[PDB]
Design a protein around this ligand. Structure first.
Ligand SMILES: Cc1cn(CCn2cnc(-c3cnn(C)c3)c2-c2ccc(C#N)cc2)nn1
Length: 116
């Protein structure tokens, strides 16, 4: 509250660390469904069904240009990529499996980097 601050974590490295995480995700073999926005002319349903599209390149642009106020807003966008993927794709598709794999990969890096 006013004039009563919790000590707070050094956040000076967050930009660099999120960039490194994102780079590791971009170079993962299963990142191919996620590298560019879903093309709304190529994919029947996508536009109407997925209210807030997101993808690695859009995250990279936002990161590179100071559009994430903090760590958590970055993790929300990453999770949005995988949540959209689950909403739109069957678990038993190549894309559905990629999303599950990439989410698991991300959350471990996230916990390893920031919780520990
Ligand atoms: C780009 C692009 C390519 N395509 C057609 C192949 N495709 C069909 N569904 C998807 C999709 C749906 N959800 N997700 C995560 C991917 C894709 C697809 C979309 C983007 C990319 C890339 N980069 C690759 C395949 N659509 N947009």
């Amino acid at each position: 509250s006013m004039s009563v601050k919790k000590p707070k974590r050094d956040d000076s490295k967050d930009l660099a660390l999120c960039s490194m995480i994102l780079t590791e995700m971009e170079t993962h073999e299963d990142a191919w469904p996620f590298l560019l926005p879903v093309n709304l002319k190529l994919v029947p349903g996508y536009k109407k069904v997925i209210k807030k599209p997101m993808d690695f390149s859009t995250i990279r642009e936002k990161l590179s240009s100071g559009q994430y106020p903090n760590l958590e807003t970055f993790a929300l966008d990453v999770r949005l990529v995988f949540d959209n993927c689950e909403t739109f794709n069957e678990d038993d598709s190549d894309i559905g499996r990629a999303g599950h794999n990439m989410r698991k990969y991300f959350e471990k890096k996230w916990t390893d980097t920031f919780k520990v």
